[model samples]
Target: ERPTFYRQELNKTIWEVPERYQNLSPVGSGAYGSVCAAFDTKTGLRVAVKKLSRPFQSIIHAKRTYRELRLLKHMKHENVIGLLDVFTPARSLEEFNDVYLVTHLMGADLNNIVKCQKLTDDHVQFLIYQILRGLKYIHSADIIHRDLKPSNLAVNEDCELKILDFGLTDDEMTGYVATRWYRAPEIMLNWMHYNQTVDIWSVGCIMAELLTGRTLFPGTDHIDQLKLILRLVGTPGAELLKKISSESARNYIQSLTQMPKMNFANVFIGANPLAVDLLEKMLVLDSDKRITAAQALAHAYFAQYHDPDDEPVADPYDQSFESRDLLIDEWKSLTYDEVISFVPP
Candidate 1:
């Protein structure tokens, strides 16, 4: 039987939530949950709340939620989203069975922005570098963000990028758990044993998407996906197939060797040369040969356009700070009454 679920109404008031959280409006929605832009009544600060439609019933579900929370709790990097609080409706488990996670609300997602304007080479490079920085921090902490699509990336008003959505993230050494178009060849080919290289492939796809305003490998099936990939990087030679051991997987890899070569530069004429170079290194059929986030961070493609000092500097005490720091930290040092006086209308 199909499961029944309840949806949170958009543009609800904060007073609807138990006294702690208030001022709610819909921000984003996805398969797992819906995000609402809200302000903490106690702290008088804006935050994004991910309200789970139902309480997780299985151990796997609970673990994924906990791992996401744990990673956010431990990570303090500039490029990763900051988790502020967690909540569950009063007796929600015993009543309607809902759960909520609160995080700093970042500005528009890259997916929306890219759709409106053709990104400049400098914009694409800056965004990709920020992605690498976030991924580097995640990998360094031994976490793998299996899902790394453009929509998962948020850019604040100041233009600083923060990688959000930890639902598909897992420990570094775990197996594949990502979407098809951005997934690495080994993973899509049923290679159970995989690692961070999968994310590099996603990065490559995103880079191409940004440059061309279309998906790099928009394959509907496994075979079609492999063909799309082969069309870009050419068929892998005999030596490459040998590195991949699964019999069925090796068969497909072997077939790829006989396929005609496809030049990415010619395919993506007028595309940035640096972007093309980086994509080639990332989308290699051999996962082991794929570029790492740290290595990509150091790549000349990113280095040529990255601006380390470009992040805006702002004073937390000013009204302009809301447009700067996603979460105003004024309450961090203020008295209860002082915080109340600073609430936005």
Candidate 2:
């Protein structure tokens, strides 16, 4: 049986849930950790707590832990999840096995809300506005949210939204960073260096789901995923296919019989024209041809919320993270730098 006091054995004992936070209920177990909805007795507020699952089991977990801690601390925007407090049950290096983050609590995520067929155009517009706003800020920092799926998008009953789950921000972690249903084609192709546009592809998937309550490209596996993508967007032109980093993946694409673009208008019968236009821009075959997060916000679909003043901010803390290998020590250094670099708003 589990311990009666703390429920779960997190770091054993020193990591006991603080007395001030009460009514902890298991709420989410996403890709990395268990999240709970807790009440903060100290401030009389509802909050969400994220605890790293098997954080020390591997170098990858450690990197994710370090990265999220750094990004949550550095990121400050209304559209991104705000870091409330972070603590570890550890009293010293020996006891340091658990890490926890307290953040803004929301009633549900877009994953759940998108399934509701009653969603009005207002609902979709507002949610997309927040997403693009968050992306605009992240991209300005030269950071890609990397894992922009419906589940990562937290929302409230009021329909406000905030983006979360930045653990996959490090490109070196893996090319399969985003959720498969939302993963960008270039990422799976293992194509040459990609940029912020990868996230725009995810937005395309999500926007389609929001409008239709179904995945735009549901595949059974990696190969099927590639096939599904090609069937809709059609095969990449020879020039773009030639740039794939993997000889095997490139050859596989070349071997496939030609496919033609599907009429998205027929696929999403009643979707707004402007939304379809933006979706097509995001779901293109060529990486360079993909719409930017910034450009998506400016589309006619979001004309109500977008303005010239709304743009990605300059990366105030642009430490180079390109065309290089990052040693663990360097990652640690970068993590430390991120936390200290941003003055909390």
Candidate 3:
């Protein structure tokens, strides 16, 4: 079906269900909303219903909802999560107020799956390549995915990676948007105005995390975060530091004037050499200096490990969902109330 028609039809009566969406079971929950596994009564096909908590109140909330819908309407990339429908409930004085978004129900997120087993270099390469491909598509559409974390990445039964969570995404031409830890130095230090490059910084952090099994710059506080970053990338030289206009940021850096240099090899002790080299280039302190998604796609690490046309591939990461039903168990643990905590106010 045409995406526009699908969205229009789904939006018209999305809120009128409970009776319509059968076998509804919990899938996952976060601050903004909860996801429930459901089957279309008419088709008997599996789908995930993402319910956003409401009054439909805040402007940010409304904007995010609209942005996600608008972006999903135009995006048709295989590596990006597919939006099947959008459901806003009919006005009611008696029932709970909520908005539901319907999409294909992929299994566990990348983080959970990574925790369950060690991923080989090839596995990491496949996942990272797909993520870059998704980012490339988003950038081509002029969208910036500010939040690019493991939990926001979904893997399906076919072993394909799909980037999820569009709540933090913004129109790339307008400005920067990203979570603190994963944010680029330009954004954090208020140097460059928002751009698609911010997503590249996140890709660096995520890729490094995948390789090391730890955060690239894990800090408990803002200062700590800066220090952690400075350590790895080496505190920016004076010429580069002068570009930052924020006095507060400059002062903060001055306070920690003499810090030890950090070695990337030490952090990712056993990571593949090519992976480490590529990660360092991506995580460069200067956002402008950081590698772009397209360039990263052509990096030697990927060129050496991947083939675009290979068929009958072997699963590098041996973790299997065939008989285990990981998705089913994950869905069963979700609680509607618990899911609301993850929503941003």
Candidate 4:
């Protein structure tokens, strides 16, 4: 078969493209790669094709490539993004540095849709329900999305929501997981360890955004991010404040003017009681106090739609990657194996 008309400067390729897909156009970029929209001619499906950035550049990138591929291949759920196909185009191991992934192409991401002021109570409830459902499936597999925001969620006009960018890497939080606006208080304070609750915090932010039609906490930087959160939730209780692991952060937080806790309804203005209650549960300053996805699904806000069959999500076991200071060759092998191993679903 022939190659794509797109040039090398575009950092694109069709070598990994199978005979069934055609009519490609640029979609967007991801943490590790470029994305293009194409139609699967045989399946009559519109799919998103992602081209991972030079995966061999560093151990970080290489390991990320491997870890994401390994996880995505096994994940299966309706609310989660589906990996339709995966392939690489290099002629041999010596030339193999590219990886391509295929996923469903959604009409518009939640971010784009939210900005257009198109969401209603039913739409919002369903969005959160789908997120909880998606999280239920991924968390069952012990994979935390880490990054959950408007842009990371895809939706259609029918109000169907699916979680995207679920499995990236679980290595460390280090201010790299969720965006600052949606980052959990624990991670914001730089707690050594974090969990699925981090994602709940993000869900809270998204939920609030949907209710208000604006970002809940738009911080300029990490420090300001924490400050913005503090302003909203106000000062933490004594027990939660004492749990702060870092002395510098503790002192810094203590020095700030202690704000009395504010009501979610007050902040959300005219949002429903059930909706505000669910959002508040997710936005707790303490990770321990934060509501789990399972709990959120059962919240009165979603009572009408919550399923009796949705099993609880287990707490994730932190799978630490023994990374850092690895030679480039090690990364190369890791990525090489990932590129070649995936059998189509």
Candidate 5:
């Protein structure tokens, strides 16, 4: 028996959501958390409730949990996942452990949609446009969605898309692997630091996947991943090679025979010329040369639907906490405070 809400066993864990959220059903699970869809009686909407997986088990997990909570609360783009509510079952700070986040339930993610049916060029354009639109706002906040893949993008039959699971950075957090095919070349080469361009690279992979109902750079591992990317984009020049942080990686690139850059138009034969052009710019081997979210939206590929008024920007998010090192208990208390104070909007 619980004091505040009903307990429902779901996904091999006891779920203690607020009284307003009922009719729980399992949705999916990932390395970091598990999600379930529940009917919110107060709002009359089905929402996704994600429970943090071992959020307090390690310092890294605890810190990530805090970052995710703070980020969800701040980001409010229509094409970005919104934090409708947050809660915890524990009655006291000492007992506080689990944290649950409430968000709008989406029909299915892009991964499932891509496989279900072939998409027209118009469908690809509009979907990619929305992704870049959301990314524009995210980048404006100086936030990099380190993880972006087909599965992370939630979509509906109407072809609308929203980006989620935006939860990583480079400082003290290198070596984190995203979905292999979507990983940027810079990340694989062990670059000392990477910027928002990493996200741009991911967008390129996703757009390519949308254009063709297949994974573009599907590599077995990091080494194979780099090989696959180079096969298409061609080998980097001496200047770009020098920028790699790892000597081994630098030599590895030099050791490989120079391959000519593959023509986008040739590879994606019969694709809209405008789309191929945009893809070429996005998939550049050099991170410094890749197309940005703002620039990509302005490209001719989206001219039919591009509206300057509709594209929005966000004030740079306060990431001062990224550098701070707090113990698991401290992070737990801070997270608890934020959760208890939240009122769904």
Candidate 6:
């Protein structure tokens, strides 16, 4: 809460950290923020200090940052990155603008790993199991990680995986709903309300990417994205089609020629039969018909890692601020409170 951490500018952004964090070096930079690898003198371990870029620039930015801080602080899972600490260079609420989030620094994210290395079946199986394991805890908390692409998945040399960035996305700034490739049909169809199954669809897409070293649906546009999905998973049934609230989206599906669902084994030849079976359940067109994170963990594909007692669940996350239309300063004040509330472990 006090001015305990040193302040410096790196990667074209200001970073403020406590005396315990040293040897700061840039790890990666992106739209959300930049991360630096630092040695935590307190814990005697490597850490990733993420400096949120223009956190209070808009209501959307402030709220997204707050959501990420809250969710990360609440979560404690092996496969979910833990929030180590939070700080602000500004000592008072009025001066608070930039926020820094600290977590364990992994060797690299899954996007780089998936692209460069040839992962074995065992590698793929364990990785998916960890993702589902992490999702089970997150879904149990009633939180959907609307964005779950390879870039967000952090991994170490041992193949240990940790899901990052629960702050959905700032679509208003990006002018896109979500990442087109891993987005679910319900989200793409403009359904009234989407549930946790949306995340299961992302897991399905990531599974396909790992199984084969390529994106499942590299669409040029939303139209092409839907077409690619339907081409593989086949067209949804009329019963499922009727659920879409958007008239245009629903009509577009009706106009398309029906496509028969292709066998997963045929698509991913030489892959284990159990893996194919699990993928089929995950990639179902209908969100209701799709396998849940809990169910997927119990599938034969993850038999080696399945342990009910070991798998943990979290209580529901607070969503009271989700619908509230607070002003930018109001959100900033809330974020300031959350940052000050963080006590170093």
Judged by lDDT, which candidate is best? Answer: 5
Span of 10 residues, lowest total lDDT, candidate 3: 1-10
- Candidate 6 C-alpha lDDT tens digits along 211-304: 8887887776667778888888999888887788889877777899999898788898888889889989999988889999998988998989
- Candidate 1, residues 1-345: lDDT per residue as tens digits? 111223345645222244455657787676567777877765577888777643244544544444454455555667888666654444322343345666777768887787667778888888888888877777766566777887789986556799887534323323322256777777766665778778888888988888888888877676787788887777877777677768887675665547665677887789778778888888887778888887788788877745545422222212232233322122221211221222122
Lowest-lDDT window of 10 residues in candidate 2?
1-10
Q: Write candidate 2's Cα lDDT for 116-187 as tens digits.
A: 647887788888888988888888888887768898998987888899876354233343333577877777
Task: For residues 1-345, write the lDDT of model 4, one tens digit per residue.
Answer: 323323233344433566566777787775667788889775678998888877767766667776777666766677888778776667677887778888888878887887777778988888889999888777776677877888889998788888887636223433423455777867765764788788998998988888888788877667767777888787776788688878887777778888977877788888888888887788888888889887777788887788868544443434454345566777677666765666656
lDDT by residue (tens digit), candidate 5, 115-227:
79889999999999999999999999999987788888999879889997784533332333345568787875566487899999998998897887767887766677778
Candidate 5's error at 310, in angstroms?
A: 1.0
* Residue pairs with backbone atoms closer than 3 Å in model 1 (clashes): 14-22, 14-23
RMSD in Å for model 4: 4.4
With a 3 Å backbone cut-off (N, CA, C), the pairs that clash in candidate 5 are none
A best-first ranking of the candidates according to their TM-score comes to 6, 5, 4, 2, 1, 3
Instruction: Tell me which of candidates 4 and 5 scores higher on lDDT.
Output: 5
Off by over 4 Å in 1: 1-20, 26-31, 41-45, 88-98, 167-179, 304-345
* Local distance difference test values of all predictions, in order: 0.66, 0.73, 0.65, 0.75, 0.85, 0.84
Instruction: Give the C-alpha miss distance for residue 245 in model 4, angstroms.
Output: 1.5
Tell me which of candidates 2 and 4 scores higher on TM-score.
4
The TM-score that candidate 3 achieves is 0.72
TM-score of each: 0.73, 0.80, 0.72, 0.84, 0.91, 0.91
| Count: clashes, candidate 4 | 0
What global local distance difference test value does model 4 have? Answer: 0.75
Q: Tell me, what's the RMSD of every candidate? A: 11.2, 5.6, 12.5, 4.4, 3.5, 2.7
